[PDB]
Protein backbone atom coordinates (compact mmCIF):
# COMPACT_ATOMS: atom_id res chain seq x y z
CA UNK A 1 0.00 0.00 0.00
CA UNK A 2 0.77 3.71 0.19
CA UNK A 3 0.46 4.94 3.78
CA UNK A 4 -0.01 8.71 4.08
CA UNK A 5 1.01 10.47 7.32
CA UNK A 6 0.58 14.27 7.30
CA UNK A 7 3.49 16.63 8.08
CA UNK A 8 1.80 19.97 7.30
CA UNK A 9 -2.01 20.76 7.10
CA UNK A 10 -3.20 22.60 3.96
CA UNK A 11 -6.91 23.40 3.47
CA UNK A 12 -8.67 20.16 4.41
CA UNK A 13 -11.09 20.56 1.51
CA UNK A 14 -9.31 21.10 -1.85
CA UNK A 15 -8.25 17.64 -3.01
CA UNK A 16 -7.10 16.93 -6.61
CA UNK A 17 -9.41 15.49 -9.26
CA UNK A 18 -8.64 13.23 -12.25
CA UNK A 19 -7.25 15.17 -15.21
CA UNK A 20 -6.03 17.91 -12.86
CA UNK A 21 -2.33 18.78 -13.00
CA UNK A 22 -0.82 18.40 -9.51
CA UNK A 23 2.15 20.71 -8.99
CA UNK A 24 4.35 19.29 -6.23
CA UNK A 25 7.77 19.31 -4.61
CA UNK A 26 8.98 15.95 -3.40
CA UNK A 27 11.95 14.30 -1.77
CA UNK A 28 12.13 10.54 -2.27
CA UNK A 29 13.87 8.30 0.22
CA UNK A 30 14.57 4.62 0.70
CA UNK A 31 12.99 2.86 3.68
CA UNK A 32 16.03 3.74 5.82
CA UNK A 33 15.21 7.36 5.06
CA UNK A 34 18.33 7.73 2.88
CA UNK A 35 17.36 10.24 0.20
CA UNK A 36 17.71 9.23 -3.45
CA UNK A 37 16.22 12.21 -5.30
CA UNK A 38 14.24 15.43 -4.87
CA UNK A 39 12.62 18.09 -7.08
CA UNK A 40 14.27 20.59 -4.75
CA UNK A 41 17.59 19.39 -6.19
CA UNK A 42 16.56 21.06 -9.47
CA UNK A 43 14.48 23.86 -7.90
CA UNK A 44 11.79 22.61 -10.34
CA UNK A 45 8.41 21.45 -9.01
CA UNK A 46 7.39 18.08 -10.42
CA UNK A 47 4.14 18.49 -12.35
CA UNK A 48 2.08 15.44 -13.20
CA UNK A 49 -1.65 15.07 -13.62
CA UNK A 50 -3.96 12.64 -11.82
CA UNK A 51 -5.62 9.76 -13.58
CA UNK A 52 -3.41 9.71 -16.70
CA UNK A 53 -0.96 7.09 -15.25
CA UNK A 54 2.08 9.42 -15.26
CA UNK A 55 3.54 8.32 -11.91
CA UNK A 56 3.85 5.11 -9.87
CA UNK A 57 0.65 3.79 -8.24
CA UNK A 58 1.63 4.88 -4.74
CA UNK A 59 1.66 8.44 -6.03
CA UNK A 60 -1.75 8.22 -7.75
CA UNK A 61 -3.42 6.72 -4.66
CA UNK A 62 -1.38 8.89 -2.28
CA UNK A 63 -1.41 12.37 -3.90
CA UNK A 64 -5.19 11.96 -4.41
CA UNK A 65 -5.57 11.84 -0.61
CA UNK A 66 -3.87 15.24 -0.26
CA UNK A 67 -5.26 18.76 0.11
CA UNK A 68 -3.61 21.84 -1.45
CA UNK A 69 -0.79 23.07 0.75
CA UNK A 70 -0.57 19.75 2.54
CA UNK A 71 2.85 18.25 3.09
CA UNK A 72 2.73 14.54 3.87
CA UNK A 73 4.76 11.36 4.06
CA UNK A 74 3.65 8.73 1.54
CA UNK A 75 5.09 5.33 2.50
CA UNK A 76 4.79 3.32 -0.72
CA UNK A 77 5.27 -0.42 -1.10
CA UNK A 78 7.28 -2.05 -3.96
CA UNK A 79 4.19 -3.45 -5.74
CA UNK A 80 2.85 0.11 -5.70
CA UNK A 81 6.23 1.43 -6.76
CA UNK A 82 9.07 -0.37 -8.61
CA UNK A 83 8.47 -3.95 -7.49
CA UNK A 84 11.28 -6.48 -7.85
CA UNK A 85 12.73 -4.92 -10.99
CA UNK A 86 13.53 -1.73 -9.10
CA UNK A 87 14.72 1.14 -11.26
CA UNK A 88 18.15 1.08 -13.02
CA UNK A 89 20.62 3.26 -11.14
CA UNK A 90 18.49 4.54 -8.28
CA UNK A 91 15.92 2.15 -6.87
CA UNK A 92 17.01 -1.24 -5.50
CA UNK A 93 14.69 -4.22 -6.07
CA UNK A 94 11.85 -5.03 -3.65
CA UNK A 95 12.04 -1.52 -2.15
CA UNK A 96 9.67 0.48 0.07
CA UNK A 97 9.98 4.17 -0.66
CA UNK A 98 9.04 7.07 1.60
CA UNK A 99 8.12 10.29 -0.19
CA UNK A 100 7.82 13.64 1.51
CA UNK A 101 5.35 15.25 -0.93
CA UNK A 102 4.17 18.86 -0.68
CA UNK A 103 1.09 19.60 -2.78
CA UNK A 104 1.85 23.11 -3.99
CA UNK A 105 -0.69 23.97 -6.64
CA UNK A 106 -3.29 22.65 -9.10
CA UNK A 107 -3.53 23.64 -12.77
Amino acid sequence: GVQVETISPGDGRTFPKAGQTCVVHYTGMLEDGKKFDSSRDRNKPFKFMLGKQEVIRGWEEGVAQMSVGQRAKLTISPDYAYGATGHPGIIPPHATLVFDVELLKLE
Binding site: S39, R42, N43, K44, F46, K47, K52, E54, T85, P88
Partner: protein, 169 residues
Protein backbone atom coordinates in the same frame (compact mmCIF):
# COMPACT_ATOMS: atom_id res chain seq x y z
CA UNK B 1 -4.43 -1.39 -47.96
CA UNK B 2 -7.44 -3.76 -48.60
CA UNK B 3 -6.68 -4.87 -52.17
CA UNK B 4 -4.21 -5.95 -54.86
CA UNK B 5 -0.92 -4.83 -56.39
CA UNK B 6 2.39 -6.70 -56.70
CA UNK B 7 4.14 -8.70 -53.84
CA UNK B 8 5.53 -7.30 -50.63
CA UNK B 9 8.71 -9.01 -49.49
CA UNK B 10 9.92 -8.56 -45.90
CA UNK B 11 11.89 -10.37 -43.17
CA UNK B 12 10.48 -11.16 -39.72
CA UNK B 13 9.88 -13.42 -36.70
CA UNK B 14 6.17 -13.70 -37.53
CA UNK B 15 4.35 -16.78 -38.76
CA UNK B 16 1.56 -16.80 -41.37
CA UNK B 17 -1.24 -15.93 -38.90
CA UNK B 18 0.61 -13.24 -36.92
CA UNK B 19 1.15 -11.41 -40.22
CA UNK B 20 -2.56 -11.83 -41.06
CA UNK B 21 -3.52 -10.42 -37.67
CA UNK B 22 -1.06 -7.52 -37.97
CA UNK B 23 -2.44 -7.10 -41.48
CA UNK B 24 -5.91 -6.45 -40.07
CA UNK B 25 -4.48 -3.97 -37.53
CA UNK B 26 -2.68 -2.11 -40.34
CA UNK B 27 -6.08 -2.26 -42.04
CA UNK B 28 -8.07 -0.41 -39.35
CA UNK B 29 -5.12 1.97 -39.12
CA UNK B 30 -5.14 2.79 -42.84
CA UNK B 31 -7.92 5.43 -42.50
CA UNK B 32 -7.46 7.16 -45.87
CA UNK B 33 -6.85 3.64 -47.30
CA UNK B 34 -3.64 4.64 -49.13
CA UNK B 35 -1.83 1.44 -48.17
CA UNK B 36 0.86 3.42 -46.39
CA UNK B 37 0.36 4.98 -42.95
CA UNK B 38 1.24 8.45 -41.69
CA UNK B 39 1.68 10.23 -38.36
CA UNK B 40 -1.69 11.93 -38.72
CA UNK B 41 -3.25 8.46 -38.82
CA UNK B 42 -1.17 7.17 -35.92
CA UNK B 43 -2.11 10.29 -33.92
CA UNK B 44 -5.66 9.19 -34.74
CA UNK B 45 -6.29 7.00 -31.67
CA UNK B 46 -6.74 7.59 -27.87
CA UNK B 47 -3.40 6.60 -26.23
CA UNK B 48 -0.95 8.09 -28.78
CA UNK B 49 -1.05 11.59 -27.29
CA UNK B 50 1.29 12.00 -24.39
CA UNK B 51 3.63 9.25 -25.48
CA UNK B 52 6.61 11.57 -26.23
CA UNK B 53 8.22 8.80 -28.32
CA UNK B 54 5.44 8.30 -30.92
CA UNK B 55 7.04 10.38 -33.70
CA UNK B 56 10.34 8.71 -32.87
CA UNK B 57 8.90 5.22 -33.37
CA UNK B 58 7.36 6.31 -36.69
CA UNK B 59 10.76 7.56 -37.93
CA UNK B 60 12.65 4.39 -36.97
CA UNK B 61 9.90 2.28 -38.62
CA UNK B 62 10.07 4.53 -41.67
CA UNK B 63 13.13 2.74 -43.06
CA UNK B 64 12.69 4.05 -46.59
CA UNK B 65 12.51 7.54 -45.13
CA UNK B 66 9.39 8.87 -46.83
CA UNK B 67 7.35 9.93 -43.81
CA UNK B 68 4.86 7.08 -43.86
CA UNK B 69 5.02 3.57 -42.45
CA UNK B 70 4.12 1.08 -45.18
CA UNK B 71 3.06 -2.50 -44.39
CA UNK B 72 6.56 -3.95 -44.91
CA UNK B 73 7.88 -1.37 -42.47
CA UNK B 74 4.95 -1.99 -40.12
CA UNK B 75 5.87 -5.73 -39.98
CA UNK B 76 9.66 -5.22 -39.86
CA UNK B 77 9.08 -2.65 -37.10
CA UNK B 78 6.79 -4.60 -34.78
CA UNK B 79 9.03 -7.64 -35.33
CA UNK B 80 11.83 -5.96 -33.34
CA UNK B 81 9.43 -6.16 -30.38
CA UNK B 82 8.02 -9.59 -30.99
CA UNK B 83 8.99 -12.20 -28.46
CA UNK B 84 11.54 -14.38 -30.37
CA UNK B 85 13.15 -10.96 -30.89
CA UNK B 86 16.80 -10.94 -29.82
CA UNK B 87 18.13 -8.57 -27.16
CA UNK B 88 20.44 -6.97 -29.75
CA UNK B 89 17.76 -5.84 -32.21
CA UNK B 90 15.98 -4.30 -29.21
CA UNK B 91 19.00 -2.34 -27.99
CA UNK B 92 19.60 -1.24 -31.58
CA UNK B 93 16.04 0.07 -31.61
CA UNK B 94 16.80 1.92 -28.36
CA UNK B 95 19.92 3.44 -29.91
CA UNK B 96 17.74 4.67 -32.77
CA UNK B 97 15.45 6.54 -30.36
CA UNK B 98 18.32 8.92 -29.55
CA UNK B 99 20.12 8.67 -32.90
CA UNK B 100 17.78 11.08 -34.71
CA UNK B 101 19.46 11.48 -38.10
CA UNK B 102 20.16 7.74 -38.29
CA UNK B 103 23.89 8.22 -39.02
CA UNK B 104 25.06 5.71 -36.40
CA UNK B 105 26.07 8.24 -33.73
CA UNK B 106 24.15 9.95 -30.92
CA UNK B 107 25.36 13.55 -30.82
CA UNK B 108 25.05 16.01 -27.91
CA UNK B 109 22.22 17.91 -29.55
CA UNK B 110 20.24 14.79 -30.41
CA UNK B 111 20.62 13.41 -26.91
CA UNK B 112 19.37 16.75 -25.56
CA UNK B 113 16.42 16.92 -27.98
CA UNK B 114 15.29 13.33 -27.40
CA UNK B 115 15.55 13.77 -23.62
CA UNK B 116 13.83 17.17 -23.57
CA UNK B 117 11.03 15.41 -25.49
CA UNK B 118 10.31 13.14 -22.52
CA UNK B 119 11.31 15.38 -19.61
CA UNK B 120 9.65 18.58 -20.72
CA UNK B 121 9.71 21.11 -17.90
CA UNK B 122 10.64 18.75 -15.10
CA UNK B 123 14.29 19.80 -15.43
CA UNK B 124 15.81 23.16 -16.30
CA UNK B 125 17.54 23.20 -19.68
CA UNK B 126 20.91 24.12 -18.13
CA UNK B 127 20.51 21.07 -15.87
CA UNK B 128 19.64 18.81 -18.77
CA UNK B 129 22.50 20.25 -20.83
CA UNK B 130 24.94 19.78 -17.94
CA UNK B 131 24.11 16.10 -17.51
CA UNK B 132 24.07 15.50 -21.26
CA UNK B 133 27.59 16.95 -21.40
CA UNK B 134 28.80 14.82 -18.49
CA UNK B 135 27.28 11.59 -19.89
CA UNK B 136 29.03 12.12 -23.24
CA UNK B 137 32.32 13.13 -21.58
CA UNK B 138 32.30 9.77 -19.78
CA UNK B 139 30.87 7.35 -22.35
CA UNK B 140 32.81 8.89 -25.29
CA UNK B 141 35.67 6.33 -24.84
CA UNK B 142 36.68 6.44 -28.54
CA UNK B 143 37.23 10.20 -28.64
CA UNK B 144 34.93 11.91 -31.21
CA UNK B 145 32.55 13.55 -28.71
CA UNK B 146 29.50 11.59 -29.91
CA UNK B 147 28.16 8.23 -28.72
CA UNK B 148 28.37 5.23 -31.05
CA UNK B 149 26.40 1.98 -30.69
CA UNK B 150 29.50 0.40 -29.22
CA UNK B 151 29.71 2.97 -26.41
CA UNK B 152 25.94 3.10 -25.89
CA UNK B 153 25.94 -0.67 -25.33
CA UNK B 154 28.94 -0.36 -22.97
CA UNK B 155 26.88 1.80 -20.60
CA UNK B 156 23.49 0.21 -21.29
CA UNK B 157 24.21 -3.41 -22.33
CA UNK B 158 23.74 -4.90 -18.86
CA UNK B 159 20.34 -3.32 -18.15
CA UNK B 160 17.28 -5.59 -18.49
CA UNK B 161 15.11 -2.88 -20.10
CA UNK B 162 14.79 -4.87 -23.34
CA UNK B 163 13.11 -7.78 -21.54
CA UNK B 164 10.03 -5.57 -21.41
CA UNK B 165 10.13 -4.26 -25.00
CA UNK B 166 7.90 -7.22 -25.91
CA UNK B 167 4.40 -7.04 -27.52
CA UNK B 168 1.93 -9.88 -28.21
CA UNK B 169 0.89 -10.30 -31.84
Amino acid sequence: GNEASYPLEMCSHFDADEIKRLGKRFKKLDLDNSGSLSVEEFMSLPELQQNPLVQRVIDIFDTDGNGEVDFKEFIEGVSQFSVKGDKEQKLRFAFRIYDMDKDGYISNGELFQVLKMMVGNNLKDTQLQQIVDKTIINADKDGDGRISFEEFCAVVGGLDIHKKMVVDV
